[PDB]
Amino acid sequence: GIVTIDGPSASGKSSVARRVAAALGVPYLSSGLLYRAAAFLALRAGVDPGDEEGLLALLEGLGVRLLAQAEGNRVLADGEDLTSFLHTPEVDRVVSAVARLPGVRAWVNRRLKEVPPPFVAEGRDMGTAVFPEAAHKFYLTASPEVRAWRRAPQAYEEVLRDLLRRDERDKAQSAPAPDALVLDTGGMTLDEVVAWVLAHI
Ligand SMILES: Nc1ccn([C@@H]2O[C@H](COP(=O)(O)O)[C@@H](O)[C@H]2O)c(=O)n1
């Protein structure tokens, strides 16, 4: 089955998912590799990383695959393993701009939905429901003050104002899925949240 870990910004959802997967001996689906793959393919093909229709045609055309493995995921394009090229400074430079294109996000989400279970992943991509039928859903919540507090401490004021905007922006998603098990992480360490999650699976 699929285990999903969701929550607001700076909720520690990714760190938790990575530990949960590691403990279960399953892969953790980190979206970053696919966005990097998209950037890489764009730069290699001479396709402007700002040209969405051109990039999408290229990505869909090549047939991209996320090989999920407990020891580390791989990304293949037309059967070629590109994984070792995804963290260079040229890819780093344009990857964010690429990830801001809505059609690329949808492409990434479709690549995520093709991976055969089991694995741990984030159930949502902002307002998009990526793994709505996962057998084990968990929602990690905490006050913006505690999330900001941990994120920083004088900077607390700044970090907080940022988190509050994202919370304001992401109002509709500031709630768990109907069948999600909720955990307030206030007063708990990373290891404690991980333990709590594993204990409810
Ligand atoms: N959930 C995610 C994960 C990564 N990304 C994009 O991919 C990049 C991070 O890739 P990594 O996580 O592998 O470092 C970020 O710059 C971000 O723009 C994203 O937009 N949404």
CATH code of 173's domain: 3.40.50.300
Determine the structural domain holding residue 46 and report its residue range. 1-201
Whether 35 is in the pocket of ligand 1, judged by its Cβ within 6 Å, is yes
Q: Hey, which residues does 119 pair with through a beta bridge?
A: 2
- Cβ atoms of residues 180 and 137 within 8 Å: yes
Distance 178 CA to ligand 1 centre (A): 27
117 touches ligand 1 (CB under 6 Å): no
Residue 59: CB partners within 8 Å, gap ≥ 6? 38, 41, 104, 107
Strand 136-141 and strand 181-184: the pairing is: parallel
What is the residue with the minimal CA distance to atom 7 of ligand 1? 32
Specify the number of domains making up the chain. 1
Residue with tokens 């793959």: 37
Q: Are 86 and 33 in contact (CB under 8 A)?
A: yes
Q: Is the CB of 118 under 6 A from ligand 1?
A: no
Does residue 73 line the site of ligand 1, with CB under 6 A? no
Contacts 24+ apart (CB under 8 A), 89-94: 90/43, 91/36, 91/39, 91/40, 91/43, 94/39, 94/42, 94/43, 94/49
Say if CB 185 and CB 142 are below 8 A apart.
yes
Strand partners, 183: 140
Residues 6+ apart with CB under 8 A from 118: 1, 2, 3, 24, 26
Tell which phi-psi region holds residue 8, choosing left (phi > 0), alpha (psi between -120 and 50) or beta. Answer: beta
Pocket of ligand 1 contains residue 17 by CB under 6 Å:
no
Candidates 132, 190, 107, 114; CA nearest to 6 is 132
CB 34 within 8 A of CB 111: yes
Flag whether 30 is marked binding: no
- Dist. CA 150 → ligand 1 center (Å): 21
Q: Determine contact, residues 38/107, Cβ cutoff 8 Å.
A: yes
User: Is residue 174 a known part of a binding site?
Assistant: no
Method by which this entry was solved: X-ray
Ligand 1 pocket residue status of 28, Cβ below 6 Å: no
Q: Where are the alpha helices (DSSP H) in the chain?
A: 13-24, 32-45, 52-62, 89-99, 102-114, 144-151, 156-169, 190-198
Which of 6, 95, 107, 126 to probe ligand 1 with, by most ligand atoms within 8 A of CB? 95
Q: Is residue 159 within 8 Å of 167, Cβ to Cβ?
A: no
The angstrom resolution of this structure is 2.2
| Angstrom distance (rounded) from CA 120 to CA 124 | 12
Q: For residue 144, say if its preceding peptide bond is cis, omega within 30 degrees of 0.
A: no
Question: Which residues, 6 or more positions from 133, have their beta carbon under 8 angstroms from its beta carbon?
Answer: 2
Can you say whether residue 78 is alpha, beta or left, with left for phi > 0 and alpha for psi between -120 and 50 degrees? left
Are 75 and 86 in contact by the 8 Å Cβ rule? The answer is: yes
Is 4 close to ligand 1, i.e. is its CB under 6 Å away? Answer: no
